[PDB]
C-alpha cells in the first residue's frame, strides 16, 4: 500500500505544548517525490487566526518549513526552502474555508514534474473538495535539506515553537503517491 505514516485519535492541548511530535517519521518523508497528506480534525472554536495543522520544520533554519495551516479559516499551504523562498503559489486567499469548532478534513497532494506535468503540481482540498491547484513547483521535503522535525500543531522553528492551537485529530495519513481529486472526495 501507499500509506507510509498513520496516526489516529490524538489531540493538541495545554498539556503537550499544543503539539504532537512525529519526528521519528521524518526519514519516510525526506525522499518522497509524489505524496498525499490527509488530516481529519476538529479545531477549537476559539482557535487563533493562524494555526498549523501539519508541518515539517527545522530547528536550524527558522525560515525553512512546509506547513498545511489555517489562516482566517482559510485552509492554506506554504513551502519554503533553504533560501526562505516560496515553493508554491499563494494559498492565503484560496477559496475554501474550514468550519470552526466542527469536524473537517484538509488534504494536500504533491506531484513531482514529469513529461505530463512539466513544472509539477500541488493541490489543497477541504472537506473533499479541491480549493486550489498550483503549478509553480512540485517541491516537497526532499527539497528542504535542513528539516529536523515533523508535527501536528505547534511547530519547532529555530529554538521557538509557534502556530499552536487546541485540535482533536481523528486521523492523519501520509501516502507515497498523489491521490486523484476523485480519490480525495472518496477519502474524505
Curated annotation (Swiss-Prot):
Transmembrane segments: none annotated. It is found in: Secreted, Cell wall. Belongs to the glycosyl hydrolase 33 family. This is Sialidase A. The lineage of its organism: Bacteria, Bacillati, Bacillota, Bacilli, Lactobacillales. The chain holds residues 121 to 305 of 1035 of the full protein.
Amino acid at each position: 500500500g501507499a500509506m507510509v505514516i498513520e496516526k489516529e485519535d490524538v489531540e493538541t492541548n495545554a498539556s503537550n505544548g499544543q503539539r504532537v511530535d512525529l519526528s521519528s517519521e521524518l526519514d519516510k518523508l525526506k525522499k518522497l517525490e509524489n505524496a498525499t497528506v490527509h488530516m481529519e480534525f476538529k479545531p477549537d472554536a476559539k482557535a487563533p487566526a493562524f494555526y498549523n495543522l501539519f508541518s515539517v520544520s527545522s530547528a536550524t533554519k527558522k525560515d525553512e518549513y512546509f506547513t498545511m495551516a489555517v489562516y482566517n479559516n482559510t485552509a492554506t499551504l506554504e513551502g519554503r526552502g533553504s533560501d526562505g523562498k516560496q515553493f508554491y503559489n499563494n494559498y492565503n486567499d484560496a477559496p475554501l474555508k474550514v468550519k470552526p469548532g466542527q469536524w473537517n478534513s484538509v488534504t494536500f497532494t504533491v506531484e513531482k514534474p514529469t513529461a505530463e506535468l512539466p513544472k509539477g503540481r500541488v493541490r489543497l482540498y477541504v472537506n473533499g473538495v479541491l480549493s486550489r491547484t498550483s503549478l509553480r513547483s512540485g517541491n516537497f521535503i526532499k527539497d528542504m535539506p535542513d528539516v529536523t522535525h515533523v508535527q501536528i500543531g505547534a511547530t519547532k522553528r529555530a529554538n521557538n515553537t509557534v502556530w499552536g492551537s487546541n485540535l482533536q485529530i481523528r486521523n492523519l495519513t501520509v501516502y507515497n503517491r498523489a491521490l486523484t481529486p476523485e480519490e480525495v472526495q472518496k477519502r474524505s
